[PDB]
From Swiss-Prot, chains A, B, C, D, E, F, G, H, I, J, K, L:
Belongs to the protease inhibitor I13 (potato type I serine protease inhibitor) family. Keywords: Protease inhibitor, Serine protease inhibitor. It comes from Hordeum vulgare (Barley). This is Subtilisin-chymotrypsin inhibitor-2A. GO terms for molecular function: serine-type endopeptidase inhibitor activity.
């Protein structure tokens, strides 16, 4: 089971989605601009994407 | 009476609305971007949705 | 004289306006996104509306 | 059951405690400096006190 | 010389401009969303307008 | 009835208290450090003092 | 395995510690003032306590 | 060498650009909304413009 | 009339006070930690000092 | 190996991209508005661009 | 070379120091309260400790 | 003339002072906790120190 996708920094949301879903079929992908403060609630099926102005993944996606 | 919809994380606002209204007919649904600070005022008939950039429910909806 | 409109949570700005103006003819209605910090200056003729992303009234409108 | 103590603005935490406990025997009193942002979690047995630099109640205490 | 326009709360930026310029011919009108923090620099010829989502004047315009 | 004390900027909290109470016998005086964000709730009997590091009144006290 | 201690709201840090350690022997207890923003990093052995000015547990302790 | 343009408050970005470039031929003009916090890094060839909602210069442009 | 004291950066609050009072006999000196956001209210008789952890003047004192 | 591009302040994102990629072929370019707070995670292959309203590079690009 | 100390969460600053210095003899240990925003500047010899109110390490120490 | 002291990260304020004053005799040293936002005003004779909880220099001191 993987929990992080270091190889996705700089890639678009379309192609980060395709990778994560290949590796984590029940993933609930959430797309947030970098800098958003999240409430501390852990979900194992969730994968948050923090994107830049061009909607490219800006940081390492992790489950939570 | 239900007060939370864990099964709605990742779903769109259209289909989260349909579920909540099935379960909570007098629900007043409020849609806010994740990260918004709310004033601490409890309403039993209110259901706030915290959405991502794609307007998908990002966190567990709860009454309040 | 009324000072609050609890029955307006979840309604649109068009129809919150109509209600307030029926009850408070000299009302100066101000529409702000939820989360905006206001300067502490009291105006008796003012009614601020704090709206969600769909421009629905998110909290209880009060005079001030 | 009361849910608010308007008559406690300006009073000390010692004497706000005594009043609330007279009226709400299972009250869990929480003392926070004014300006603290709280997580939106409703507790019926909780009474938060927002105090000034002199630990005097600065705003109207309410259950939540 | 006037320094404040209490009668402009709720009016649009077009018609607040017309009033201020009638009363203060060298006015440099600056339009900011309510909630913006300004740097503390005093200008006698400046009039800042703090507007709501509908671009209506939300607070009392003052010189500075 | 007075609602503001421009003549109190720079004075200590002890002597601002004495003035306000002379003019406003039922005043509930609240002492907050400058910069504190307050919840928008109007109280006619309340007088908030915004103080500096030396507990001197830093801004013009007003009722609210 | 328990992950939350609803019965600890209002209790002191000394006696919240004793309870958690009875139920979760490898717990790493972290004490933070309410309002602190945490980095989103999940630890199963960690239990964060959010305390008020009197160091009483202010919110429901949860593992993470 | 000039380092500030007090006469540019209220003017548009097009005509502030023309002035600055007349006076400071190697100027790197940066346009930011008023309220943006900048990292403390000094550049002698840079001129930041802090603009209002109408893209009018809101504060005194300075080199840095 | 002077309005700024560039020569006071790095000096203590005791000796900045002595200078300002020599030059501005009716000065109301307010001492705030650097970083404090002030409400935009201009007072000609006020001189705010923004100090570091050692209470040394950190920035250029100005009237306002 | 270069780690900073001082000569790119004021240039557009298109032409900053071309320069960085000439010098750092595996660069993952991330475009963020000035003022965005980033999580402290170091990546050697990443180059963040902090842009103004006109998408011009506002600060010195560095690897990280 | 190690870059992280997962086994130090919950331990005091005295004993986190001893561990890090055993593993990283030239370490420059910096102790910050959890929640502090740092400037994005990478130092290989630096190890920041984010501590709780009891000065216990609250998060995983990493080099940077 | 030096403008930065990379070799001072981790050292105390007493001994950072001694170094800077050896190299920059007219230095006005300002000590601020890490995380403080400064107003963008450049002073060539100023050296700001950003310190941790133990008053150790946490970041690279620079003139400004």
């Amino acid at each position: 089971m993987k929990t992080e996708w270091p190889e996705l920094v700089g890639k678009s949301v379309e192609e980060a989605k395709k990778v994560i879903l290949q590796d984590k079929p029940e993933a609930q992908i959430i797309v947030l601009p970098v800098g958003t403060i999240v409430t501390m609630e852990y979900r194992i099926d969730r994968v948050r994407l923090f994107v830049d102005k061009l909607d490219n993944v800006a940081e390492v996606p992790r489950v939570g």
